[PDB]
Design a protein around this ligand. Structure first.
Ligand SMILES: *[C@@H]1O[C@H](CO)[C@@H](O[C@@H]2O[C@H](CO)[C@@H](O[C@@H]3O[C@H](CO)[C@@H](O)[C@H](O)[C@@H]3O)[C@H](O)[C@H]2NC(C)=O)[C@H](O)[C@H]1NC(C)=O
Ligand SMILES: CC(=O)N[C@@H]1[C@@H](O)[C@H](O)[C@@H](CO)O[C@H]1O
Ligand SMILES: *[C@@H]1O[C@H](CO)[C@@H](O)[C@H](O)[C@H]1NC(C)=O
Ligand SMILES: *[C@@H]1O[C@H](CO)[C@@H](O)[C@H](O)[C@H]1NC(C)=O
Ligand SMILES: *[C@@H]1O[C@H](CO)[C@@H](O)[C@H](O)[C@H]1NC(C)=O
Ligand SMILES: *[C@@H]1O[C@H](CO)[C@@H](O)[C@H](O)[C@H]1NC(C)=O
Lengths: 413, 424
């Protein structure tokens, strides 16, 4: 059995790996020609809600009267007519929109608000399409570093797009990562506070967001160890446009003792699960990597929301009709801890985490706006010719609050 | 041998000391008479970068190049490796911004016989750095007792204030001229008076502040960011809000939950820890503010000390030992260069870092920050009318809605985590 402790020291310190991603995965105009057909059926659907009189054939939208169960009706077929509730503007609609999935018996979804259903339904067909496009075309089709980043600095030293590793994410496009280029010295800070950390100005043109994906105009960032995997879909911090985001941070280093009643691994060598992520071991990695494998074993393909195991295709209805139901089964089984993954996988015996302490400020200030934006388009001035609008930019600072090597340590008893 | 202790909980205790500062160190309308020429020059520089075709020799060459000659910008054109070129900014006249073109300041000394180019890879960086340095060269010439009046007075900033249930008004804060932000207002500093306690967690028992930024009066080319700078710290600490401070955005009810850590170190061979700073050889210039010792204070005064040796002068952003003087180029034409050396030579970072001992009795205020837009429609008009009648107490009324920040600063449901390192 074990006991706990806390300790810290004040050495000049190494800097984390910083990943940046535009929340909008692809320049809308550059994907439009792939999606236009779907952008007709969606709008036709929305046009069905109020004010007006092939994809739908695969995943048919449905209207469910809560008067009945096992009874559902085509969203484009006939309908008419409200359940009371306690100005007052809340009521529950007797009808509700949804869609279903089947294997050949079926499983469904239904959404509080019609418009919400459509936008989920759209997200399905969006993936059902993009899963069929090759990586090179995607990477060519998403943002480039030299246009995503307007400027950046680190302890006054400048940085170019050169200093960023490309990292393509299936759901967020071209993410870029600072301070983790291979065979180069990891950056470090000898001073705490903003002006000694990373500062960068992002460009985020709302004009190219594809409307049918719900999001705010902004960018994600993730802080992680150089050999670690971002998991952009989950753990990131989003940045709103037209603001400073001052992400101060403390480093924290964690450790745990190995006992039969306190198990862990130093590098994952203990588990049979192969690691498909090309990144250091971690509980989340070993789980998902096991999940993808279990899926390929029983649905003949891999989920598009994750990297792709070897000798497998990315799932898509057009090639695997019973795909989504198969997925649904597994995911539920996984949540029910029925799949082996949840049992044989284990934590790391030690890890680092950057405890963030974010805060926001309006930028540029209303007076400064009159000149700063012109200059910020003389910078980048051969790549862009518009006068940038305030909402096209976002300023970001990453910096250590204090150069303190905080840690948590254990001793046996 | 070693010994340790650990804990968590809540208890009635002394509230932090809190500082508020406006991000623009001066009310433009109260100082532009002193910056008119610099701004006029700045506008031309921008014109001469952004759109030269709009310029005219009979319009530009009226300007006060005696300011420019002190520390000019230059284009470094090195996209011809076999022959680089340097151009002072004073069929198109458009200046280069290609890959091989860099924007730089030519710092100089010794009747400007010696000079060094300081680089920036973007105009936005260069221009801000330049203006800041020029402005600094002007502010130094002003006696503080007058300059203090050109910052936002508390009477304008702190529209409304409350502490738990207890009443409040700007006169309850202490005022210090923190040179990078002008007037900073410290709450509950515990220096002049006994510090306030607080009995309970939750917003109902913290600070409530409603602050007015007055964006319309910011110094145009300074102060790129809007919203109050804010910091928490122990009683009788300076604080060094330029580095350790949080922001809070206008038009929001930025709400800060607080949690306290405290630590003491084991001893010198485990870390050179001093109890009250009486050991170190550094003069600790800040002592006129009766603050305690702190690693920060020692570093900065150490920097200032070296500069008083190397440049017979003291830089504007740090206090002065009473006999010395701030660095006007009028009086020390080489100060900018002399200063830059102490910035660039990392040996001068480390010699102080080696000389200044760590502070014992460490105290840290962990913060969790949260926001929501404010006021909502259910509150705006009538609260802003109430506050309008607060601003109506001005000799002549002035109003705005874009400029108001609201803060809540309070302890979390557990408010202390004592920890210890002790020899045994
Ligand atoms: C460019 O602008 C500078 C900065 O304002 C001008 O400097 C100003 O010069 C006047 C006249 O010399 C100064 O007023 C006088 O100061 C002396 C002592 O310094 C005093 O004995 C006189 O009674 C009078 O007050 C003024 O202080 C000074 N301003 C600053 C900030 O130094 C300069 O004239 C302009 N040059 C050109 C080429 O346009
Ligand atoms: C299971 C399966 O057939 N997977 C295919 C594989 O045949 C092909 O070589 C690969 C090339 O990208 O695409 C995937
Ligand atoms: C994609 O490739 C096409 C053709 O080479 C080119 O026009 C376009 O600029 C490329 N975009 C990116 C981001 O590589
Ligand atoms: C440090 O705090 C301890 C109590 O935790 C107190 O006994 C001691 O006097 C304090 N010393 C200083 C230098 O503040
Ligand atoms: C500082 O502490 C030392 C011992 O640590 C003590 O001798 C001295 O009197 C103290 N001085 C002040 C000013 O507190
Ligand atoms: C505060 O500082 C001033 C100037 O350093 C000094 O005159 C005064 O005695 C100090 N102490 C108090 C309690 O005011």
């Amino acid at each position: 059995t074990v006991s706990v402790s806390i300790k810290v020291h004040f050495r000049k310190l190494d800097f984390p790996a910083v990943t940046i991603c535009n929340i909008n995965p692809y320049k809308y105009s550059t994907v439009r020609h792939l999606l236009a057909d779907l952008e007709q059926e969606t709008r036709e659907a929305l046009k069905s809600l109020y004010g007006f009189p092939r994809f739908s054939h695969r995943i048919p939208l449905l209207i469910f009267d809560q008067d009945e169960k096992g009874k559902a009706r085509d969203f484009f077929t006939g309908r008419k007519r409200s359940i009371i509730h306690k100005n007052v503007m809340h009521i529950e609609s007797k009808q509700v929109v949804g869609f279903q999935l089947c294997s050949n018996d079926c499983a469904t979804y239904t959404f509080s608000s019609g418009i919400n259903a459509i936008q989920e339904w759209y997200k399905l067909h969006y993936m059902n399409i993009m899963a069929q496009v090759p990586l090179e075309k995607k990477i060519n089709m998403s943002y480039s570093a030299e246009e995503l980043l307007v400027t950046c600095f680190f302890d006054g030293v400048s940085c170019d797009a050169r200093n960023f590793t490309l990292f393509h994410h299936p759901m967020h496009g071209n993410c870029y990562t600072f301070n983790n280029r291979e065979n180069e010295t990891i950056l470090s800070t000898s001073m705490g506070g903003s002006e000694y950390g990373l500062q960068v100005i992002l460009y985020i043109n709302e004009e190219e967001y594809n409307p049918f994906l719900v999001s705010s105009t902004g960018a994600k960032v993730i802080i992680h160890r150089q050999d670690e995997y971002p998991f952009v879909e989950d753990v990131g911090t989003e940045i709103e446009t037209a603001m400073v985001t001052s992400i101060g941070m403390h480093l924290t280093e964690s450790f745990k003792l190995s006992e039969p009643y306190s198990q862990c691994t130093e590098d994952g060598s203990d588990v049979p699960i192969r690691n498909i992520y090309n990144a250091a071991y971690s509980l989340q990695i070993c789980l998902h990597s096991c999940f993808q494998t279990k899926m390929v074993e029983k649905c003949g393909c891999a989920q598009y929301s994750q990297p792709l195991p070897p000798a497998a295709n990315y799932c898509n209805y057009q090639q695997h009709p019973n795909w989504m139901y198969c997925y649904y089964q597994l995911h539920r089984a996984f949540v029910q801890e029925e799949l082996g993954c949840q049992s044989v996988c284990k934590e790391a015996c030690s890890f680092k985490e950057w405890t963030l302490t974010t805060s926001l400020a309006q930028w540029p200030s209303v007076v400064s706006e009159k000149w700063l934006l012109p200059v910020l388009t003389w910078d980048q001035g051969r790549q862009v010719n518009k006068k940038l609008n305030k909402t096209d930019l976002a300023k970001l600072l990453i910096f250590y609050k204090d150069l303190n090597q905080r840690s948590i340590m254990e001793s046996p008893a | 041998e070693v010994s340790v202790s650990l804990s968590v909980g809540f208890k009635t205790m002394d509230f932090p000391a809190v500082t508020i500062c406006n991000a623009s160190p001066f009310k433009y309308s109260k100082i532009k008479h002193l910056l008119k020429d610099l701004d006029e020059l700045m506008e031309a520089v921008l014109e001469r970068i952004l759109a030269p075709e709009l310029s005219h020799a009979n319009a530009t060459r009226n300007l006060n190049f005696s300011i420019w000659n002190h520390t000019p910008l230059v284009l470094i054109d090195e996209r011809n490796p076999h022959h680089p070129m340097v151009l002072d900014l004073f069929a198109s006249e458009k200046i280069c911004n290609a890959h091989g073109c860099k924007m730089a300041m030519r710092l100089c000394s010794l009747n400007r016989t010696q000079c060094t180019f300081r680089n920036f890879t973007s105009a936005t960086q260069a221009l801000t750095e330049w203006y800041i340095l020029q402005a600094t060269n002007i502010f130094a010439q002003v006696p503080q007792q007058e300059l203090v009046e050109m910052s936002y007075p508390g009477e304008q900033m702190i529209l409304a204030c409350l502490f738990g249930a207890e009443p409040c008004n700007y006169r309850n804060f202490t005022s210090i001229f923190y040179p990078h932000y002008g007037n900073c207002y410290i709450f509950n500093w515990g220096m002049t008076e006994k510090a306030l306690p607080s009995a309970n967690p939750g917003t109902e028992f913290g600070l409530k502040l409603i602050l007015d930024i007055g964006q319309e009066d910011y110094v145009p080319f300074l102060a790129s960011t809007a919203g109050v700078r804010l910091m928490l710290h122990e009683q009788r600490s300076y604080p060094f809000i330029r580095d350790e401070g949080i922001y809070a955005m206008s038009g929001t009810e930025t709400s800060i939950g607080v949690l306290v850590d405290k630590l003491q170190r084991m001893g010198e061979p485990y870390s050179p820890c001093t109890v009250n700073g009486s050991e170190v050889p550094v003069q600790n210039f800040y002592s006129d503010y009766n603050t305690t010792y702190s690693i920060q204070a020692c570093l900065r005064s150490c920097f200032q000390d070296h500069m008083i040796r190397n440049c017979n002068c003291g830089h504007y952003l740090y206090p002065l030992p009473r006999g010395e003087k701030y660095c006007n180029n009028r009086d020390f034409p080489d100060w900018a260069h002399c200063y830059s050396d102490l910035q660039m030579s990392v040996a001068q970072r480390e010699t102080c870092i080696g000389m200044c001992k760590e502070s014992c009795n460490d105290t840290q205020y962990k913060m969790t920050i949260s926001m929501a837009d404010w006021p909502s429609e259910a509150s705006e008009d009538w609260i802003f009318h109430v506050l309008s009648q607060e601003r109506d107490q001005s000799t002549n009324i002035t109003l705005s809605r874009k400029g108001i920040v609201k803060l809540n600063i309070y302890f979390q449901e557990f408010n202390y985590r004592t920890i210890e390192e002790s020899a045994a």
